[PDB]
Write an enzyme that holds these catalytic residues in place. Structure first.
Site, short mmCIF file in Angstrom:
data_model
loop_
_atom_site.label_atom_id
_atom_site.label_comp_id
_atom_site.label_asym_id
_atom_site.label_seq_id
_atom_site.Cartn_x
_atom_site.Cartn_y
_atom_site.Cartn_z
N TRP A 84 0.85 -1.17 0.00
CA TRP A 84 0.00 0.00 0.00
C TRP A 84 0.90 1.24 0.00
CZ3 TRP A 84 -2.59 1.43 5.27
CH2 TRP A 84 -3.42 2.55 5.13
N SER A 85 0.65 2.15 -0.92
CA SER A 85 1.42 3.38 -1.05
C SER A 85 2.94 3.14 -1.05
CB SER A 85 0.99 4.35 0.06
OG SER A 85 1.36 5.64 -0.42
#
Length: 222
Positions: A84-85
């Protein structure tokens, strides 16, 4: 080690390695496990988290250390990596290194990741998570966050030819979601862009988890 945790350990549908986001802890991903019951999930946390000294010098160095862990946990490929990110950016550099050393990386999952070196809230993110930035947890997390954001800003993602899934939340003004996040489709010839609903920072909270898990399941099932 204590920074590698394996969820759904008896699953037989494949494995997926997930790198922590910028806060440094892979705990947000734990809620995925019941929602991805056919996937062995190996979630990686930052081993330098508590250490004001001895931070990773570069994102590349972090990735190189995580590859080691991946090979120890899954000695045989093909590999599926993601995050994530910030974690998605590290997973890309991991995939870049593994493929340069002869491994097959069949899937790379960038969950709403951006490339800050191209297209460039520390405390406010915790407040939004419900943690006191000034509590003992709070300070470490903000410190971890700013360093990882500095690692990302100094890193440029290389051209990568393997399959890449970029899961994108809604883009302000509905502009091109790939350029808005600093990525260049000329470097990612086998990019697939997939929607995931909600806000970038909210993707793993209680309300969103089921829709985020749906988007991950769809990305892996190409």
């Amino acid at each position: 080690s204590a920074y590698v945790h394996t969820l759904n350990p008896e699953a037989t549908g494949g494995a997926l390695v997930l790198v922590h986001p910028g806060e440094g802890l892979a705990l947000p991903y734990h809620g995925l496990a019941p929602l991805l019951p056919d996937v062995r999930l190996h979630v990686l946390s930052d081993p330098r988290f508590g250490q004001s000294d001895n931070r990773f010098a570069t994102l590349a160095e972090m990735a190189t250390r995580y590859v080691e862990w991946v090979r120890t946990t899954e000695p045989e490929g093909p590999y599926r990596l993601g995050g994530w990110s910030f974690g998605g950016v590290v997973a890309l550099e991991m995939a870049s290194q593994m493929t340069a050393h002869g491994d097959e990386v069949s899937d790379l999952l960038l969950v709403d990741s951006h490339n800050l070196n191209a297209a460039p809230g520390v405390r406010q993110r915790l407040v939004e998570l419900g943690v006191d930035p000034d509590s003992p947890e709070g300070v470490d997390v903000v410190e971890e966050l700013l360093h990882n954001g500095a690692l990302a800003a100094q890193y440029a993602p290389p051209a990568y030819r393997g399959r890449v899934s970029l899961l994108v939340t809604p883009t302000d003004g509905d502009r091109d979601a790939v350029r808005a996040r600093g990525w260049d489709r000329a470097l990612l010839p086998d990019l697939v862009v997939e929607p995931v609903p909600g806000a970038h920072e909210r993707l793993f909270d209680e309300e969103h988890l089921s829709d985020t898990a749906d988007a991950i399941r769809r990305a892996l099932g190409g």
